[PDB]
Paper text:
In particular, KOR–Gi1 and KOR–GoA are bound to a psychotropic salvinorin analogue, methoxymethyl-salvinorin B (momSalB). As salvinorin ligands (such as momSalB) lack the basic nitrogen atom, there are no attractive electrostatic interactions observed between the salvinorins and Asp1383.32. Although the two agonists overlap in the orthosteric binding pocket of KOR, the core rings occupy different planes that are perpendicular to each other. Another major difference between momSalB and GR89,696 is that momSalB mainly forms hydrophobic interactions with residues that specifically contribute to the high potency of momSalB, such as Val1082.53, Val1343.28, Val2305.42 and Ile3167.39. Another hydrophobic pocket formed by the side chains of Val1082.53 and Tyr3207.43 and the backbone of Gly3197.42 appears to be a key determinant for agonist activity and receptor activation, as mutations of these residues significantly decreased or eliminated signal transduction of momSalB with a threefold reduction in its ligand-binding affinity. Mapping the atomic distances between the ligand and receptor showed that GR89,696 makes closer contact with residues in the KOR–Gz structure than in the KOR–Gg structure (in terms of distance), whereas momSalB in KOR–Gi1 and KOR–GoA largely overlaps and displays similar strength. In particular, relative to Gi1, both GoA and Gz exhibit a 6 Å displacement in the αN helix, whereas Gg has a smaller 2 Å displacement. The major contacts made by GαoA with KOR are through residues in the α5 helix, whereas contacts made by Gαi1, Gαz and Gαg involve regions in both the α5 and αN helices. Whereas Gαi1, Gαz and Gαg have similar interface areas (1,219, 1,262 and 1,221 Å2, respectively), GαoA has a much smaller area (1,096 Å2). As positive allosteric modulators, the four representative G proteins display distinct allosteric activity in potentiating agonist binding (Gi1 > GoA > Gz > Gg).
Residue numbers in the entry:
A (entry chain D): 11 to 51, 59 to 61
B (entry chain B): 5 to 54, 183 to 235, 242 to 354
C (entry chain E): 2 to 120, 124 to 137, 139 to 235
D (entry chain A): 56 to 202, 205 to 214, 220 to 299, 303 to 339
E (entry chain C): 3 to 29, 32 to 340
The structure:
C-alpha cells in the first residue's frame, strides 16, 4: 500500500544537503561570471 | 532583397494567404462542449446528433456544429477548461433516473452544475441542459419521490410535476442574467434533438449579433 | 524524386518545340523550377526560371522574348515552348528543382536532360580549365566580377559536379554548406570574388567537370568548368 | 421681423453640433475598437459623409445673407458637387446600416458570410462610387445664372431639371425610407420572440428601449427630410417673401438630420461610450 | 502496518523537515549586488498570422527560428529576424498545450488533449513537413514535451506521470511516477541527465532520467504549479503557481531559497523563463503583463506590457538576444 511511499520518503530524506550559503554563493558566482554575456541585463 | 529572399517572401505571402483562407473557412464553425455523467448523459445525444478527446462534426441547416467529448479525461477539470472559453454553448446532461440511485446521481461532487455555471470562463457561455431518461422516469416515479435527492419537495407525484421540480432546481443554480439555460426532455427514442440545440445556437448568435450592433 | 525530360530531337530552323518535364516523388507545387541548357562541348547556361504560384518569371537575356516557361501543378508538369529556333539552340536541356526559405537547398536535384538539335550581367569564369589528378587533395578556384557576400552574411556561390554521362549534382550551397548525400571530404572556402573548393583524400568517382554558379541576382551565370581526370 | 436672425442662429447651432459630434465620433472610433467590426466601418463612413455635408453651413448662411452669390463659379461647382455627393453617401450609409442590422438579427446563419469586414468595405466602396456618379454629373452640368438682376447657382443646362429633381427624390427619399421601415419593423417583430428580450421583469424594458431607439431614428429621418423634398416638389410643380424664407428653414432641417445622425447611431450604442 | 507505516512515514517527514531546517540559514544573504533597477525592453517584432490563442512556443538552437502552436490547429515556424513564415504545419488535433523544437533542428514536437506527442520532420525530402512517430501511451493530456536528442523525448502528462520515450521504436522506455496531482510543467537539465517536474499537488519533483526514480521533492507552494524552469547552472530551478507567487528552489540544499510575490499581484503565473546569465527571471501572469524579477534580489525590475490578453507562453533565446511572448490575443511579440 503506502510502504512504497514510506520507502521513497526514507530514500529522499537520506541524502546529502549543503547549507544555504553555498547555494546562494553558487548562484551569485554564476550570475557574475556570465553577466557580460547577457545583453538583456542587436540582431533585431 | 536577394533573389532567394524575394522567393522566401513570396512563399511567406502564399502561406499567409492560406492561413487567411483556412481561418475564413473555420470562422463559420460552431463549437459546443459536451458534458455530463456516465449514466446515459453523453452517448445518447452523441448518437442522436447524427482517445483523449472525441470530435463529433456535422452540418445542420448550413451550420457547422462540432461537439467536444472530453469524457475520457478522468482528471481535474480546472487545468483544461480554459481551452473551451470560446465555445458557443455547453451541452450539459443531468440524469433524472438517478434521483434515488446511489453513486446519489444528483449530487455529483455536490456541484457538477455549480462548477460549470461559474468557472470564471463560462460567465456568459450558455448551457443547454438535457434531462435524461424521461421514459424511465414516467415508468419509475412511483417509488419514494421525497428521498435523498431533495428532502424539501412538499409537492405532487407523477412525471409532469417531479420533472418540472428537478428542472427548476437545476436552473436555480444559474445566478446569471446574461447567461441562459435551455432545458429539454429526452428519451433516447425521439428524432427531434438536433433542433433543440440548433434553435438555442440561433438564439446565442442573435444575442451576439445584437451586442455587436451596439443595441444591448 | 524523379524529374523526367521529354521532347527534343532534330528540328528545322524557324520551327517551335515544346519541351516537357514530368515531376514525381516530391511536392511539386512548393518548388521553384529552372531550365538550364548545356552546349554539346561547352559549360552550362541558364535559360529560364519559374517560381511557386507562377508569380515571378525570369528569362535569359540571350533567349528572352522568344521562349515561354509555364507549369501545371494538378498535372505536375513543367513546360518550355521555344519558337524561332536558331543554330545556338542546339543544346541539351535540364530541369532543376529549387526551394527558397531559411536554410533551404536550391538547385539540389537536377533531372535527366533532353537533347535538341537544330540543323547588367555578371561574368563568372574559372581561371583553370583542366587539372590532371587518387589519394591526394585538390583545390579548385572560382572568380567573380562582383562580390557575392550580401549584407546578411550570406555568400551565393554554389558548387556543382558533372560526371561523364550523368546529370549535374549539387555539392555545396552558399559557400561551404554541404548537401544531402555528399561525403564530408568535400569543403568550401573563400571571400569576395575568390572562392576555393577543397577535396581531401580524393577517391574515385570524382572524375568529371566542376562548375560554380551564382544566385546573387538574375540572370544566372555559370562558370567555365574545371575538368579533373585521372 | 426676427426671422433671418433666428434662422441664422439655427444654422450656427447645426454647424457647431454637427462638427463636434462628427469629430468626437471619428476620434473615439480611431482611438478605440480599431474598426474591427462592420458596424464600426459603417459608422466611420456615416461620420465622414456627415462631416463633409456639415462643412457647408457658412456657405448657405452667407448665400441667404448676401442674397445672390458671394463665392464664384469654381466654388459653386465644388460646393454643389460636394453637397450632392455627400448627401447621397449619408443616405445610402443609413440604408446599409439598416440592411446590416436586419441581416444580423433576422438571418443570423448567412450573416456569418455577408457581415464580414471585407464585404462591408466593398459595399462602402460601391456607395462612394454611386454617389460620385451624381457628384460628377452635378459638377459638369451645374452653372450660375443672372436671371431679375441676381446671380445664383443651379443645375442650369426641356426636362433637364424636373427629371433630375424626380430622380434625386426617388434615389434619396422613397427607397431609403421604405428600406428603413421594412428592415426595422421586421427586425423588431423577429426580436420579440427571442430570449434575453422576452416577457419578464427585466427583458421587456430592454426590448422597449430598443424599439424606442429605432422609432427615434426613423422619426428623425422622416421629420428632417420630408419638408425639403415637399417644398422642392411644390416649387417645381415672385419668390422673395416668407415662402422663400421657409426654403432655408427646410434646408436647416435637412442639415439637422446630418447633425443628429451621429448622436443617434453612435452615442446611443452599447459598444460605444466605453 | 495500517497505522505503524503511517506513523513511520510521518516521523520520517518530520525528520526530513528538521534536517532541512538545520541545513538552512548559514552565512538577508544579499551582498548589495547593485541591481539592474529598471530595464526598458521594447517590442522589436510582431508575428501576425495566428487566428486563435497561442498556447506554447519554443525557440530553436540558432536563435533565429521559432515554432508556435495555436488553438486553430496549426504550428507555425517563423523566421524571427525577417518576420517570415518558414513553415505552416497543419495538425490533426487543434487542442495543443505544448510544442518543442529539436536541438538538432530536424524535428518539432506537438501535444495536447489528444494524449499523443506527435513528431514532425522538417529537414526531409519532398519539400513538405510530414507526421512521423505519433507517440501514444499517456492516459491524461500532455502539458509539456522536451527533446533530449533526435532519438529521445520526455513528456509530462495530466495522469500524474512523466515519461521518457525513444522515437526510433515508438515505445516508452521509462515511466516517472510519484506525483499525486496533474503535472503541468517540465524543464530539462543542461546536461540532459536530470529534470524537474511541477504538479497541481503543489509539489515539484526532481528526477534522474537514467535511474528512473525521484531523487528529491519540494512542497513549498499552496496551489497548482503551472510553470517550471532550470537555472542555467543546472543546480537550481524556479517555478510559479496559481497562488500569485514564484519560488526559486535549489537542488543540493533541497529547500525553497527565494520567493517572488507582491501585494497587488493576485493572478496566477502561466510561464516562467530565465535569461542567459540567470540574473533575470521573466514570468508571464494572468494580469496581461510579463514581469521581470531580479532572481537574486526578489524585486520587480521590469514590466512587459504589450498584450491585450493572458500571456500564455514565454521563451528566451539561447544567446540571450530576444524574449518572445505569446498570449491569447493571437499575436506573439519579440522584446529586446
Ligand atoms: C443635404 O443638404 C443639402 O440639401 C440639398 C437638397 C437638394 C434637393 O432637395 O434636391 C432634390 C436641394 C434643395 C436642391 C436645390 C439646390 C440648389 O439649387 O443649390 C444649392 C447649392 C448651390 C450651391 O451649393 C448648394 C443646394 C440646393 C438648395 C439643394 C440642397 O440644399
Amino acid at each position: 500500500q503506502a510502504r512504497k511511499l514510506v520507502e521513497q520518503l526514507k530514500m529522499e530524506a537520506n541524502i546529502d544537503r549543503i547549507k544555504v550559503s553555498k547555494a546562494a554563493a553558487d548562484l551569485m558566482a554564476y550570475c557574475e561570471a556570465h553577466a557580460k554575456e547577457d545583453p538583456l541585463l542587436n540582431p533585431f | 532583397l536577394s533573389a532567394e529572399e524575394r522567393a522566401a517572401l513570396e512563399r511567406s505571402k502564399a502561406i499567409e494567404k492560406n492561413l487567411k483562407e483556412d481561418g475564413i473557412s473555420a470562422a463559420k464553425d460552431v463549437k459546443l462542449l459536451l458534458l455530463g455523467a456516465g449514466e446515459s448523459g453523453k452517448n445518447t445525444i452523441v448518437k442522436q446528433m447524427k482517445t483523449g478527446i472525441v470530435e463529433t462534426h456535422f452540418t445542420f441547416k448550413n451550420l457547422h456544429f462540432r461537439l467536444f467529448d472530453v469524457g475520457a479525461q478522468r482528471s481535474e477539470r480546472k487545468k483544461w477548461i480554459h481551452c473551451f472559453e470560446d465555445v458557443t454553448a455547453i451541452i450539459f446532461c443531468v440524469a433524472l433516473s438517478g434521483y434515488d440511485q446511489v453513486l446519489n446521481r444528483m449530487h455529483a461532487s455536490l456541484k457538477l452544475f455549480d462548477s460549470i455555471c461559474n468557472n470564471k470562463f463560462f460567465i456568459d457561455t450558455s448551457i443547454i441542459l438535457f434531462l435524461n431518461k424521461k421514459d424511465l422516469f414516467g415508468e419509475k416515479i412511483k417509488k419514494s419521490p421525497l428521498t435523498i435527492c431533495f428532502p424539501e419537495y412538499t409537492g405532487p407525484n407523477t412525471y409532469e410535476d417531479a420533472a418540472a421540480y428537478i428542472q427548476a432546481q437545476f436552473e436555480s443554480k444559474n445566478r446569471s442574467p446574461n447567461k441562459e439555460i435551455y432545458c429539454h426532455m429526452t428519451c433516447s427514442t425521439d428524432t427531434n434533438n438536433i433542433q433543440v440545440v440548433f434553435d438555442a445556437v440561433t438564439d446565442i448568435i442573435i444575442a451576439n449579433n445584437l451586442r455587436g450592433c451596439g443595441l444591448y | 524524386v524523379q524529374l523526367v525530360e521529354s521532347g527534343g530531337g532534330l528540328v528545322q530552323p524557324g520551327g517551335s518545340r515544346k519541351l516537357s518535364c514530368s515531376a514525381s516523388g516530391f511536392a511539386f507545387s512548393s518548388f521553384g523550377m529552372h531550365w538550364v541548357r548545356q552546349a554539346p562541348e561547352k559549360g552550362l547556361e541558364w535559360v529560364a526560371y519559374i517560381s511557386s504560384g507562377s508569380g515571378t518569371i525570369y528569362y535569359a537575356d540571350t533567349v528572352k522574348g522568344r521562349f515561354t516557361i509555364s507549369r501545371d501543378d494538378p498535372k505536375n508538369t513543367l513546360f518550355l515552348q521555344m519558337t524561332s529556333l536558331r543554330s545556338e539552340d542546339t543544346a541539351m536541356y535540364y530541369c532543376v528543382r529549387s526551394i527558397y526559405y531559411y536554410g533551404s537547398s536550391p538547385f539540389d536535384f537536377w533531372g535527366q536532360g533532353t537533347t535538341l538539335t537544330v540543323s547588367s550581367d555578371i561574368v563568372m569564369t574559372q581561371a583553370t580549365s583542366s587539372v590532371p589528378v587518387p589519394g591526394e587533395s585538390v583545390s579548385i578556384s572560382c572568380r567573380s566580377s562582383k562580390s557575392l557576400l550580401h549584407s546578411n552574411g550570406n555568400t551565393y556561390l554554389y558548387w556543382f559536379l558533372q560526371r561523364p554521362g550523368q546529370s549535374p549534382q549539387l555539392l555545396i550551397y552558399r559557400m561551404s554548406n554541404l548537401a544531402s548525400g555528399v561525403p564530408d571530404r568535400f569543403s568550401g572556402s573563400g571571400s569576395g570574388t575568390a572562392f576555393t573548393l577543397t577535396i581531401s583524400r580524393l577517391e574515385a568517382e570524382d572524375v568529371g567537370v566542376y562548375y560554380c554558379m551564382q544566385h546573387l541576382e538574375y540572370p544566372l551565370t555559370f562558370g567555365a568548368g574545371t575538368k579533373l581526370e585521372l | 421681423p426676427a426671422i433671418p436672425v433666428i434662422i441664422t442662429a439655427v444654422y450656427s447651432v447645426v454647424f457647431v453640433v454637427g462638427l463636434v459630434g462628427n469629430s468626437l465620433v471619428m476620434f473615439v472610433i480611431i482611438r478605440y475598437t480599431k474598426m474591427k467590426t462592420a458596424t464600426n466601418i459603417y459608422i466611420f463612413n456615416l461620420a465622414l459623409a456627415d462631416a463633409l455635408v456639415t462643412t457647408t453651413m457658412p456657405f448657405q448662411s452667407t448665400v441667404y445673407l448676401m442674397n445672390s452669390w458671394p463665392f464664384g463659379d469654381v466654388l459653386c461647382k465644388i460646393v454643389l458637387s460636394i453637397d450632392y455627393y455627400n448627401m447621397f453617401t449619408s443616405i445610402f450609409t443609413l440604408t446599409m446600416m439598416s440592411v446590416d442590422r436586419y441581416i444580423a438579427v433576422c438571418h443570423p446563419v448567412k450573416a456569418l458570410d455577408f457581415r464580414t469586414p471585407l464585404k462591408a468595405k466593398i459595399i462602402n466602396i460601391c456607395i462612394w462610387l454611386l454617389s460620385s456618379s451624381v457628384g460628377i454629373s452635378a459638377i459638369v452640368l451645374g452653372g450660375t445664372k443672372v436671371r431679375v438682376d441676381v446671380i445664383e447657382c443651379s443645375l442650369q443646362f426641356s426636362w433637364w431639371d424636373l427629371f433630375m429633381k424626380i430622380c434625386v427624390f426617388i434615389f434619396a427619399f422613397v427607397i431609403p425610407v421604405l428600406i428603413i421601415i421594412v428592415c426595422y419593423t421586421l427586425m423588431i417583430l423577429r426580436l420579440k420572440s427571442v430570449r434575453l428580450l422576452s416577457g419578464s421583469r427585466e427583458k421587456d424594458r430592454n426590448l422597449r428601449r430598443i424599439t424606442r431607439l429605432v422609432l427615434v431614428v426613423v422619426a428623425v429621418f422622416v421629420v428632417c427630410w420630408t419638408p425639403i423634398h415637399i417644398f422642392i416638389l411644390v416649387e417645381a410643380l415672385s419668390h422673395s417673401t416668407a415662402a422663400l424664407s421657409s426654403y432655408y428653414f427646410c434646408i436647416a432641417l435637412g442639415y439637422t438630420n446630418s447633425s443628429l445622425n451621429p448622436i443617434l447611431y453612435a452615442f446611443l450604442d452599447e459598444n460605444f461610450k466605453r | 502496518e495500517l497505522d505503524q507505516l503511517r506513523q513511520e512515514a510521518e516521523q520520517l517527514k518530520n525528520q526530513i523537515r528538521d534536517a532541512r531546517k538545520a541545513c538552512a540559514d548559514a552565512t538577508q544573504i544579499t551582498n548589495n549586488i547593485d541591481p539592474v533597477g529598471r530595464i526598458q525592453m521594447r517590442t522589436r517584432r510582431t508575428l501576425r498570422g495566428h487566428l486563435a490563442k497561442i498556447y506554447a512556443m519554443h525557440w530553436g538552437t540558432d536563435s533565429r527560428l521559432l515554432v508556435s502552436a495555436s488553438q486553430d490547429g496549426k504550428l507555425i515556424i517563423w523566421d524571427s529576424y525577417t518576420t517570415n513564415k518558414v513553415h505552416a504545419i497543419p495538425l490533426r488535433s487543434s487542442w495543443v498545450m505544448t510544442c518543442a523544437y529539436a536541438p538538432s533542428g530536424n524535428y518539432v514536437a506537438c501535444g495536447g488533449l489528444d494524449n499523443i506527442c506527435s513528431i514532425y520532420n522538417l529537414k526531409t525530402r519532398e519539400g513538405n513537413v510530414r507526421v512521423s512517430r505519433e507517440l501514444a501511451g499517456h492516459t491524461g493530456y500532455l502539458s509539456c514535451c522536451r527533446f533530449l536528442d533526435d532519438n529521445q523525448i520526455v513528456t509530462s502528462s495530466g495522469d500524474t506521470t512523466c515519461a521518457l520515450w525513444d522515437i526510433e521504436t515508438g515505445q516508452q522506455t521509462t515511466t516517472f511516477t510519484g506525483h499525486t496531482g496533474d503535472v503541468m510543467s517540465l524543464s530539462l537539465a543542461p546536461d540532459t541527465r536530470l529534470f524537474v517536474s511541477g504538479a497541481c499537488d503543489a509539489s515539484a519533483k526532481l528526477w534522474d532520467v537514467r535511474e528512473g526514480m525521484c531523487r528529491q521533492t519540494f512542497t513549498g507552494h499552496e496551489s497548482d504549479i503551472n510553470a517550471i524552469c532550470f537555472f542555467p547552472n543546472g543546480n537550481a530551478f524556479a517555478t510559479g503557481s496559481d497562488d500569485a507567487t514564484c519560488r526559486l528552489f535549489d537542488l543540493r540544499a533541497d529547500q525553497e531559497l527565494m520567493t517572488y510575490s507582491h501585494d497587488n499581484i493576485i493572478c496566477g503565473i502561466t510561464s516562467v523563463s530565465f535569461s542567459k546569465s540567470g540574473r533575470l527571471l521573466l514570468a508571464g501572469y494572468d494580469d496581461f503583463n510579463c514581469n521581470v524579477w531580479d532572481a537574486l534580489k526578489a524585486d520587480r525590475a521590469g514590466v512587459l506590457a504589450g498584450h491585450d490578453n493572458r500571456v500564455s507562453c514565454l521563451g528566451v533565446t539561447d544567446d540571450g538576444m530576444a524574449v518572445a511572448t505569446g498570449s491569447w490575443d493571437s499575436f506573439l511579440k519579440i522584446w529586446n
